[PDB]
Amino acid sequence: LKKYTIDLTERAEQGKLDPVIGRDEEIRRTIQVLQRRTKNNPVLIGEPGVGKTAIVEGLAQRIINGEVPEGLKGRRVLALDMGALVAGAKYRGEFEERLKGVLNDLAKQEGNVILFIDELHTMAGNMLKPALARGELHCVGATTLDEYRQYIEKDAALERRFQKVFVAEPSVEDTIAILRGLKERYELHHHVQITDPAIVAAATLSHRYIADRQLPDKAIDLIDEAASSIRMQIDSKRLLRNKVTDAEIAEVLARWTGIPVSRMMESEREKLLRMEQELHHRVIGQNEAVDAVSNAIRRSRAGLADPNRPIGSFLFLGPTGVGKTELCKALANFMFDSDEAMVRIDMSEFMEKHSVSRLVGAPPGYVGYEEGGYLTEAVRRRPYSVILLDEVEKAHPDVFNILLQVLDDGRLTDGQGRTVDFRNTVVIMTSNLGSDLIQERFGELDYAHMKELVLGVVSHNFRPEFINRIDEVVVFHPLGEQHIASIAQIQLKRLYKRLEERGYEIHISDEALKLLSENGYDPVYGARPLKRAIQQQIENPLAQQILS
Amino acid sequence: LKKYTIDLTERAEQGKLDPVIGRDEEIRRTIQVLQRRTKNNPVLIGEPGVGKTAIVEGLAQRIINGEVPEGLKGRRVLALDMGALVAGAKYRGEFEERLKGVLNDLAKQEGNVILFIDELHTMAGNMLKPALARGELHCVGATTLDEYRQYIEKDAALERRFQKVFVAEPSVEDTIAILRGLKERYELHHHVQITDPAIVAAATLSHRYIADRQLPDKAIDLIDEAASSIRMQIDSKRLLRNKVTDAEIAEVLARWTGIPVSRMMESEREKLLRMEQELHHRVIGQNEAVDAVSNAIRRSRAGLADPNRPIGSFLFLGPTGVGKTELCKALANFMFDSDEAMVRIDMSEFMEKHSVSRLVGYLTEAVRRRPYSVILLDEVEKAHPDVFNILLQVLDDGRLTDGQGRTVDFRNTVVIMTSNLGSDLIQERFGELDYAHMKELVLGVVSHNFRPEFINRIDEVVVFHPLGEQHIASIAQIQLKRLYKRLEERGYEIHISDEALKLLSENGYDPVYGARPLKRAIQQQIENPLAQQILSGELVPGKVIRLEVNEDRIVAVQ
Ligand SMILES: Nc1ncnc2c1ncn2[C@@H]1O[C@H](COP(=O)(O)OP(=O)(O)O)[C@@H](O)[C@H]1O
Ligand SMILES: Nc1ncnc2c1ncn2[C@@H]1O[C@H](COP(=O)(O)OP(=O)(O)O)[C@@H](O)[C@H]1O
C-alpha cells in the first residue's frame, strides 16, 4: 500500500462509516462465501440501493467489534483510490492503466486484505481477470441485477470466484427498525428531534405508491428530506419546529408521488366513509339499493373470500346505456386508482371453436405466439386491475372453461411460458341474454323482478358449474329520465372550456336541457342515434357565429 | 487559496450576478438537498437553456444577503473554473495534476467552498469520484435531461450522491417579468429603444409555433434575432425602424418555421377560410366538399358538434386513381408541410383475425424527430371489432396507449378518418356532370352488410359529384399538356388533333382502370409514332406538328 493506504476498517474505527443495524440474515452468507477456501468473492445482487452499504460497509464496523467468525480475525478490509487513480495520462487508454501499481501489494498481504466493491461491473475490467485468475486476490463485490445478469455470460475468470448473493429488499416492518438507529445520525446533522410515529410514515405509506426506490432506501431519504425541510421552515427569510412528525413525511411524500394528501392521509376505512360519495360523484345513483356490490369490495379487506380466487366474482346484468361503461370504471377509480384499468372485450369473437387461443394464447409453434393473448397480456400488463368481460353468453355452444380456471384455482395459464396470476382482480361479466327489456315497468320498488325472468332463460347457454363461482348477481339499476339531468352535463365540458374563452354569456333558462333529456331510456333502438338529438338542432345554427 | 479559483460569491459580495424572480421554489429545493447528511449535492436539470446557471446565480445573492437558512452562513459557493486547468501545458498528461491541487486543498474548508460544476455532462471528470463522502468536495450540478441519463443514471456510483432539480419552461408573463426589473442593460446594448411590447410578440407567438425550441432560450434567441433583422437600418446611413416593432417580429417568425406572412396578416375567421378554396387548382371541382371537410376543425379543434363521435364514414365517391386516394398527395400546403404522413389503409374485406400485427422497426424513425405534423387515416369502412377495438378510442382522446404509452400529442397533431368507397354501385365516367346525384344511397354504397349506427355517426355527410363523360384527359392533363409541350424549345410545338381530343374523349369507358386506358387508347402517338417523320434527320424548322384524320393509330406526318 505504498502510494495510498485507504482503509475501510479505519473509517469504521473513526465512525466515518455510517452506523449500521439489521442485515444479519445476509451477513451470514457474505462471510460464509468470503472466508471460504475457494469462491472467495461475494457479489451483492439486487435493486440499486437495497442495502449493499448495509452488508459490506458495515462489515468493517463488524470486524473491530469482534462478532465476526474466526479466520476473519485480524483481517482488514481495504480499498483502492479507484475513482481518482485509475488514470494518469491525458488521452484514452486509462481504463486499467495504473491498476498494476496497486494490485501487486495485495498478493503480499497473505490472506488478510479484502478489497472493496469499487463498482465491479465497471472493473470491462482489463486487468481484473488477470488479477483474479490466481484467486489470491481477496475481495468483496456488489452489483445490481441489471448489471450482474447483462454484464457477464460465461466468464470462468469471474463466476469461478463469485457467489450469487441475490440480496433482497426488506419488508415494510424491517426498514422502520433501520431508522431507529439511523435517527442518531440526524439528531446532530440537521439538529432536529425525530419521533417514533414519524418514521413509520416513510415506510408503510410510501409502500403502496412509491416503488422507484427499495424499502430501506425510500424510507431513509423521506425521513431526511423533512429533516432538510426543517431549517427551510425555521429559517425562511415563531416557526421553530425541530420535532418532526408524520405530517412532515406525508407532506414531502405528496410532493413526490404526484397524488396529493387528499387520497393519502387517511385509513382505508376513513375514505370508505366517502367511498359511496366518491362512487356517486359519477355514478347515476339509486343509493338505497345498489350498495350491495359496494359492500362486496368492502368485504374484501377482512379476507373471508377464497384465497385461491380473485377478489371478486359477479354478474353485471341489465340494459345497455345504463352503466355498462359508467359503473365499471368507478370500481377501478377507488381501489385500483386508475382510468386505464379497462379490459373491455366483446366475446362475439367466439364464432369459431379455434378462438380459445386468441384471448388466451396460441401454443408454441402455432400462429399467435409473438403477441400473446388478450385476457392474459393485458393482465400480464395490469395485474392490479379489475377485469370486465363484455357479453359472456356468446361463447361457443360446445367450448367453454375460458373463465373457470380463473375462478376455481385463481390462476390462469396462457400459451407463452409464464402463468398469469389473477389474485388481485375482480371479474365483471355482462352476459346480457334476458335483461334487454328495459321497456317494461319492473322498477318501481324492486329491481330484481327484471332479473327473475333471466335465471329461467339465461341457463341454456350457461352451466351449473359456472354460476357457483360468482357470488352476487348484481342487477343494473336503470337509467331513469330525471336521472339523466345529473350526468349529461359532463359531455358539454369542451364548450364549457369554450364559453369562458370569449367573454360571452349564453347561459340558459330552460332552452338546452330538453334535448339533454333525450339520451338513454329507450323503447326501440338505443342511445347511438339518440345522441343525435343535440347536434342537428343546436350545434349547427347557434354556435356557428362564434368563430366568425 | 487566493487566485487558483473564481468564487462566484466573491462576485456576489458586490452583486455581480443575476436575480431570480418566479423560480424561488426550485432555489428552496437547492438548499433542501444540500442540508442533508447523506447525498447532499444538487443538480439543476433543465431543458436547453432554461436558467440552470441562474439558480446558483440566484443562490449567490442569497448567501451574503442572508436569505439562505442559518447553516449556509459563511459557506461561500464557488464555480468549476475550466480555464485554470488546461492553460499552459508543458508535457504529456497535464490534466490530473492541476486538477488535484485545486481539489485536495478543500479538505480542511469543512463545507465552506461549495463547488458548482456547470456542464456536469462533460465533467471525463473521473478524478472527482472517490471522495464525495469525504467532505473534501461538495459539488453543485447543472445538466440537461438526456445529458444526465448518460453520465449519472447509467451508473450506480453517482446515482446516490446527486439529486435532480427539474427546471421547466416558464410562463410567458414571468419570462417578461424578470426582464421587467433587469431592463437597463437591454436598453443600451441591443440597439433597441425602450418599449413595452417588444418582448411580447416573440414570447406569446413562439411557445407553440417553434415549440421544438425552448422559450427560456428563446428568451434571448428571439430578442437577439428578431432585433437582428431590425439591425439592417439601426445604424446604417418616424423615418425608419429605430424602435422595435412587433410585426417584424411576426414577419421574421415566418422566416423560421415556414408558416408565411399570408396567415399572419389575415383575420381569424379568414385564417380557417383559406383551406376551403385550396384544392381547386390541381384537383378540379369540389366547391362544397372542401368547405365542409375542415368544418369539423371549426367543430372539434375549437369543439362544437358533439365531440363524443367518430369523424365519419359515409360515401365519398371517386374515380380510380385520380381523385380517390390522390387527395392526401396534394396536401403538402396546409400547416406544417408534412409529406411523411403516409398512413392510409384499405379496410374493405378484412374478416380474418390475422391482419393486425404489422402496425404494432420504424416507429421512432419518422414521427418523433418532428412531432407536430399531420397524421392521416382514410378508407376505414368495413371491419369488425377485432381491428376496431384499437380504433374505438382513436376516435377521440388524442393520446395513444396500445404500444405507444407516452404523450401522443394528437390534439395538436391531427386525427382524421374518412371512408372513400367510390368503387361500385355508382361511378363517374370521365369528369364533367352536374350536381343532381349528391346523396341518394344510404344502405347501398358503403353500408352493404353493416349496421346503420356506423353511417349515422358522421358529421360531414358530404361528397363531390359523380361527374362524367368528357374530362379524364383534362383532370389528368399531365399527359396532354405537360408531355406535349415537352419540346417547347428548338422551334417545336406538338399540336394534337381533335381525334385524340374530342373523338375518343368518351368511348372506351371502363369503371375499373381509368388512368391506364388513357395510356392505352392514346398509347400509339406519343414518341415514336411521332418519330415517324420528326426525329433522326428531320429536325429542320419551318413546319408545324399536327395529326390527321386516320384510324385510332396515326402516323404523325408533318
Ligand atoms: N441496515 C442499515 N443500516 C444502516 N444504514 C443503512 C441500512 N440499510 C441501508 N442503509 C443506508 O442506505 C444506503 C444504502 O446504500 P446502498 O444500498 O449500498 O446503495 P447502492 O446499492 O446504490 O450502492 C446507505 O446510505 C446506508 O447508510
Ligand atoms: N352515462 C353517460 N355519460 C356520458 N356519455 C354517455 C353516457 N351514456 C352514453 N353516453 C354517450 O352515448 C354514446 C353511445 O353510448 P352507448 O355506446 O350506447 O353506451 P353503452 O356502451 O353503455 O351502451 C357514447 O358515445 C357516449 O358518449
Ligand SMILES: Nc1ncnc2c1ncn2[C@@H]1O[C@H](COP(=O)(O)OP(=O)(O)O)[C@@H](O)[C@H]1O
Ligand atoms: N426566466 C429567465 N428570465 C431572465 N433571464 C433568464 C431566464 N432564464 C435564463 N435567463 C438568462 O440565461 C442565463 C442562464 O444561462 P443558461 O441557459 O442556464 O446556461 P446553460 O444552458 O449553459 O446552463 C442567465 O444568465 C440569464 O441571464
